[PDB]
Design a protein around this ligand. Sequence first.
Ligand SMILES: [K+]
Ligand SMILES: [K+]
Ligand SMILES: [K+]
Ligand SMILES: [K+]
Ligand SMILES: [K+]
Ligand SMILES: [K+]
Ligand SMILES: [Mg+2]
Ligand SMILES: [Mg+2]
Ligand SMILES: [Mg+2]
Ligand SMILES: [Mg+2]
Ligand SMILES: [Mg+2]
Ligand SMILES: [Mg+2]
Ligand SMILES: [Mg+2]
Ligand SMILES: [Mg+2]
Ligand SMILES: [Mg+2]
Ligand SMILES: [Mg+2]
Ligand SMILES: [Mg+2]
Ligand SMILES: [Mg+2]
Ligand SMILES: [Mg+2]
Ligand SMILES: [Mg+2]
Ligand SMILES: [Mg+2]
Ligand SMILES: [Mg+2]
Ligand SMILES: [Mg+2]
Ligand SMILES: [Mg+2]
Ligand SMILES: [Mg+2]
Ligand SMILES: [Mg+2]
Ligand SMILES: [Mg+2]
Ligand SMILES: [Mg+2]
Ligand SMILES: [Mg+2]
Ligand SMILES: [Mg+2]
Ligand SMILES: [Mg+2]
Ligand SMILES: [Mg+2]
Ligand SMILES: [Mg+2]
Ligand SMILES: [Mg+2]
Ligand SMILES: [Mg+2]
Ligand SMILES: [Mg+2]
Ligand SMILES: [Mg+2]
Ligand SMILES: [Mg+2]
Ligand SMILES: [Mg+2]
Ligand SMILES: [Mg+2]
Ligand SMILES: [Mg+2]
Ligand SMILES: [Mg+2]
Ligand SMILES: [Mg+2]
Ligand SMILES: [Mg+2]
Ligand SMILES: [Mg+2]
Ligand SMILES: [Mg+2]
Ligand SMILES: [Mg+2]
Ligand SMILES: [Mg+2]
Ligand SMILES: [Mg+2]
Ligand SMILES: [Mg+2]
Ligand code: NA
Ligand code: NA
Lengths: 151, 401, 221
Amino acid sequence: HYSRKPQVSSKSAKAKVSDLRCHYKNTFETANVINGMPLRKAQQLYRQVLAKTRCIPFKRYNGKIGRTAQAKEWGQTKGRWPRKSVVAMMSLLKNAEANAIEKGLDPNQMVIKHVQVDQAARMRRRTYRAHGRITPYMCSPCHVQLFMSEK
Amino acid sequence: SHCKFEHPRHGHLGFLPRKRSRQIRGRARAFPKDDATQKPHLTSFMVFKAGMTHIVRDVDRPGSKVNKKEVVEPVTILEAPPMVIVGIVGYRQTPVGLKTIGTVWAHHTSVEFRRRYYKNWKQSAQLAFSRQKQFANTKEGKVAEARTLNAFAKKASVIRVIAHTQLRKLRNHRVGVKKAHVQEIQVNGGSVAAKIALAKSLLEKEVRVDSVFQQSEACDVCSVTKGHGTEGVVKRWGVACLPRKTHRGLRKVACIGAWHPARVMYTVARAGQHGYHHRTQLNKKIYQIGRSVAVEPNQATTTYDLTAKTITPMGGFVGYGTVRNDYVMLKGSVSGPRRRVMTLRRPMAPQTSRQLKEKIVLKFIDTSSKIGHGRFQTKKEKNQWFGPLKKDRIRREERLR
Amino acid sequence: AFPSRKDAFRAQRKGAKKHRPEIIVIDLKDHVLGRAAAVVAKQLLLGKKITVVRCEQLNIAGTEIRNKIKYLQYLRKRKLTNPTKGPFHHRAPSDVFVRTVRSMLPRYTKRGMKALNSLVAYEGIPPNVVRTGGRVVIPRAQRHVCYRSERPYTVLGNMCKHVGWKYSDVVANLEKARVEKASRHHEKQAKLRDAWKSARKEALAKMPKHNVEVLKKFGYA
RNA sequence: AAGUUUGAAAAGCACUUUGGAAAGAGAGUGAAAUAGAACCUGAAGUCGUGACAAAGACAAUGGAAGUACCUCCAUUUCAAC
RNA sequence: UAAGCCCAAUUAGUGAUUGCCCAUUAUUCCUUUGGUAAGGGCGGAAACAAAGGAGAAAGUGUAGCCCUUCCGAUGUAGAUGUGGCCUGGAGGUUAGGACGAAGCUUAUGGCGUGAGCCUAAGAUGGACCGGCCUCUAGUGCAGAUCUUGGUUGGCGUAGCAAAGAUCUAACGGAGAUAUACUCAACAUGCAACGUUGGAUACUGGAGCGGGGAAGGAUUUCGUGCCAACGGCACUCGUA
RNA sequence: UUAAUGAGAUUCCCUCUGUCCCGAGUUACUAUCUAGCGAAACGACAGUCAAGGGAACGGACUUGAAGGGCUAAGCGGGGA
RNA sequence: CACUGACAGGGAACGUGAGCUGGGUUUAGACCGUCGUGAGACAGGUUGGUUUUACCCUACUUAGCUGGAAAUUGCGAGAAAAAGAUUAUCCGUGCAAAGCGGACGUCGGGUCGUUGGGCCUGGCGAGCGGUGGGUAGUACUUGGUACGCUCAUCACC
Ligand SMILES: [K+]
Ligand SMILES: [K+]
Ligand SMILES: [K+]
Ligand SMILES: [K+]
Ligand SMILES: [K+]
Ligand SMILES: [K+]
Ligand SMILES: [Mg+2]
Ligand SMILES: [Mg+2]
Ligand SMILES: [Mg+2]
Ligand SMILES: [Mg+2]
Ligand SMILES: [Mg+2]
Ligand SMILES: [Mg+2]
Ligand SMILES: [Mg+2]
Ligand SMILES: [Mg+2]
Ligand SMILES: [Mg+2]
Ligand SMILES: [Mg+2]
Ligand SMILES: [Mg+2]
Ligand SMILES: [Mg+2]
Ligand SMILES: [Mg+2]
Ligand SMILES: [Mg+2]
Ligand SMILES: [Mg+2]
Ligand SMILES: [Mg+2]
Ligand SMILES: [Mg+2]
Ligand SMILES: [Mg+2]
Ligand SMILES: [Mg+2]
Ligand SMILES: [Mg+2]
Ligand SMILES: [Mg+2]
Ligand SMILES: [Mg+2]
Ligand SMILES: [Mg+2]
Ligand SMILES: [Mg+2]
Ligand SMILES: [Mg+2]
Ligand SMILES: [Mg+2]
Ligand SMILES: [Mg+2]
Ligand SMILES: [Mg+2]
Ligand SMILES: [Mg+2]
Ligand SMILES: [Mg+2]
Ligand SMILES: [Mg+2]
Ligand SMILES: [Mg+2]
Ligand SMILES: [Mg+2]
Ligand SMILES: [Mg+2]
Ligand SMILES: [Mg+2]
Ligand SMILES: [Mg+2]
Ligand SMILES: [Mg+2]
Ligand SMILES: [Mg+2]
Ligand SMILES: [Mg+2]
Ligand SMILES: [Mg+2]
Ligand SMILES: [Mg+2]
Ligand SMILES: [Mg+2]
Ligand SMILES: [Mg+2]
Ligand SMILES: [Mg+2]
Ligand code: NA
Ligand code: NA
């Protein structure tokens, strides 16, 4: 039930999560950077982002965010270190690795071939403004799907 | 309608944009006009700002109220280690500007000069100028060098030498940089052949600051001013402060333009970068060209002050340290902080004024501490004042026992 | 301008000889600025590659002071709120000619800019154009056929050197050197030219006679 | 405000595996599981992704006429035609 | 030696009276449409199997009976006409559908000047429904600071800055000390929770101290628990 | 006309001062960067100018002059 | 009134309020004079009387990243270059001269083909050199480079 089909199904592993409760835009940035990576390189990247020695490049959702020197490796100038999205994607990568191992594949040979982050159904709260106004205070969850294929 | 009253505009529009300088070193945009009747000579030199002090001298300006009277002059001390000539460049006049004909490199280059070609020298392969050094002394390389020199002789109208600073000689702990600063120094005077001969003689050789400049001459200084980051209109441009009652802030320009033209003009003061701009300052008199402290100890001793002391004040120059090499004492101030490399250039303005031709003789140089209110010129005077202290007595007790 | 290593490698693989496009070199000396500009603009729009030299020797009708004042009036035009991005007043004579042609072109279309990039303008005759072939003139834009000789005229270089152009003396010295070199090379090769002329004269007798009569019929012998 | 309108029938996903769980990956029921539970169909708008077309700055859109490239489309021809 | 002004001309004292460019204009050709339209044909001439053809309706209006011939065609407000298009129902009449009905999708083609109609394909759907004549109406949307519902750039932006404040160890917790190879550890699992002990601070008796009224009504207590809620967090909680 | 009284209106004087000449330095909280969380207003379409005409003050039109693309912090000239 | 060389006149939506300020004009309170029967009026006087929003686009000020000459493509070839078996077949000097001065060689061999053919590669030596070692005496701002002889290799070969 994925938007894309793996080249060889028996050599691929799939992982999915729905209504993640992390920010959709931050997760969009965080998951997109590992598309095309080996699994191990992506996991190293997430650990180094947690350590704040490398950043997640922010594209398309970087409006008036700060500039950093760690974005230069991605050809960018704006990047951040969104830890909630990173840990959620680490859990998703662990699930994909578990699926690959149970299928009988080698987790050290997998290459992430598909990442897709979509906005989930939103959750509604309220904020209170001046002059007795009540205004939406919304949450934007996300769906994340991926599959990786052995090379 | 017209502005009610008149005052001059704030700031000089000829120093726009007020952006950060592309380089940190002072670079002479132009050189003094070339006079072919003069002997070939160098027109600039690179120095490092150590600090400031003041001197005493007797003025010889007839018609002034300070004629034959002593005045106190603040001065800037600039350390001037010898420079090394490593290259020759020639320029040809074309109707689109000067174009450099080619470069003649010295057979041997210093490690400091070759560090300038790397961002991380100590972890590099350090292969700079290696192929060039192998090729230069072969038959083909000698032929190529002769060909380039012949091209200089035939076509060049401007001859410049490539010189670099010696940071190992400048044994300074606060100057962190170890890669040499490289600049082109134009050779003025004589024919193109005479300039080529002088440049060839200077190749792979040191140049001392007293060869390029002499005492009581003036010079131009090219340097980058001290940086201050983002600043408001009050400090960046000198506009007036608004009344105390102003809503949303008073350190502003009240009107940044009329309704028409329907846009902000480039002549209106705005917030932005202040400082770290390249400036060329004119007519800095050279009050003293001192030798290295290792050669001549009594740097700051005059004829009128026999006290044996060096140009470094008590406690050293704040944030710089001691001056170990040759130095230049310029009258007044120069743009930039301490430790910044600066270019002394031979003057480009006429030097016929009574002030620019005055012969400077120093009678006193202040070497008191620049930390606090210094009141001793030397350590000897301080020890004379205090006599033996508790520490010295503890030391002598530890010695004799 | 400097070719890419890719382009040089491809040329080596193809092995083709040196290629020079068909380019017309116009000697703009003693030419009327506007008329030469109009002719050159039309020829550029027709797809021709044009290089113009000695643009410092173009002519404008009227005294030099009147044309200096016209240029200074042009220089008065600037965007007041930001002179950067305002009108750019080029002072070199070749740049002045390029601007005149550009004003006679549809400069705000791809076609007009294609025409404009096909024009190369120099002051004097630089070495890369000296030996590329015989230079042309524009008969309908030449000064001796366009101006009544009584009236004063301006040389473009003299006006430009007083409105801000810096390379008047450099161009003069380069032209002096070029003409000296070309005169030396033309005094030489005189033996070659005389040898070829005498060779044709002797061939007139060494060739079959009916061919000589045919040449006489068509005014060649 | 709100059709609990899944399916013929709960046959409402046993069991394995990763996960603290939510869930995922398999497996299974069913004719259908993008029919998996307030679940028939599932539009527009907006968004994600893969592939491709390119493209300065002429805001973009638009007309008219060509051309380059593509076309899971429509016709007509394939031989004394 | 105009590319200015005033006069003249059309390849020039050579031999006659049209230099050239551009219209939704003129002339002409083709096609459409409508006339205060103008005419012809319409009693099937005769003959003719497969292995020259087809049509020919006495007609306002249609895919117009058919053919020939002339003339006019823009247009706000406005009028009128249309075998003109479309929608939900009703009388009729013909069909279609589990070998897939309506709905929905389209670089999916065809037809029509158009409103639209029809076909194709769904790797869409799963049970109704099309054409024609007539009858009928709650019968056609781009905008009304239109109604309702949803979405949306702004935007990971403004901000979440009064009431001074937290630190440390241990325990608890999935919430860690979480790594493919090279490999001592830092440079690759961060940050965050509750309790207890220490430390530090604040409230400073007109108290973030004890009890009551009004109002509230189970918020009280213990155990479990973390989906949602306490605009950050929670393992804590008036959840 | 009036002692006393007045967050009442006015003038002058002493004192005093950053009200000013004429600004400078420093602090806390912001802004600024990050983690988590996360709106609104407004939104025809969009956004470089000069001059011309034009509903007589153009972002679109005419003729010229500019204009490589994307960004962070500010700013209040225009967006009548 | 006082300095000064002078204290010119004007425009920019009678420039400029999301720049300020709010003394005036011009709400609601109140007083006076005049007017009006009155409610009330007076460009008459008086006193008191909320100055909201930028985070969007441009402009401007600074501050970063980054492609691009067919201004992203074409392979679409233009040098402010040299001057030659058509730049190929050496290098200097000389005026695009007349001339002049210099070039490492030997003996094979492993391919493709006018001229002591082109390309590649082996064995010896010779040179101009680089990089290190040994050993002098100097120069230079004096810890670090160079220069003289002598080995070692390495590159042109
Ligand atoms: K004014
Ligand atoms: K949709
Ligand atoms: K097309
Ligand atoms: K106007
Ligand atoms: K106008
Ligand atoms: K005002
Ligand atoms: Mg901000
Ligand atoms: Mg930011
Ligand atoms: Mg609020
Ligand atoms: Mg309220
Ligand atoms: Mg004035
Ligand atoms: Mg002024
Ligand atoms: Mg500093
Ligand atoms: Mg205020
Ligand atoms: Mg001091
Ligand atoms: Mg309802
Ligand atoms: Mg089955
Ligand atoms: Mg389906
Ligand atoms: Mg459904
Ligand atoms: Mg109408
Ligand atoms: Mg109905
Ligand atoms: Mg489409
Ligand atoms: Mg209705
Ligand atoms: Mg509608
Ligand atoms: Mg949004
Ligand atoms: Mg913020
Ligand atoms: Mg905060
Ligand atoms: Mg706030
Ligand atoms: Mg607080
Ligand atoms: Mg930790
Ligand atoms: Mg206390
Ligand atoms: Mg307190
Ligand atoms: Mg206290
Ligand atoms: Mg209390
Ligand atoms: Mg919360
Ligand atoms: Mg009272
Ligand atoms: Mg009172
Ligand atoms: Mg801000
Ligand atoms: Mg942040
Ligand atoms: Mg305008
Ligand atoms: Mg507008
Ligand atoms: Mg504004
Ligand atoms: Mg006026
Ligand atoms: Mg005004
Ligand atoms: Mg304003
Ligand atoms: Mg205001
Ligand atoms: Mg007021
Ligand atoms: Mg009365
Ligand atoms: Mg008042
Ligand atoms: Mg009042
Ligand atoms: Na003439
Ligand atoms: Na898509």
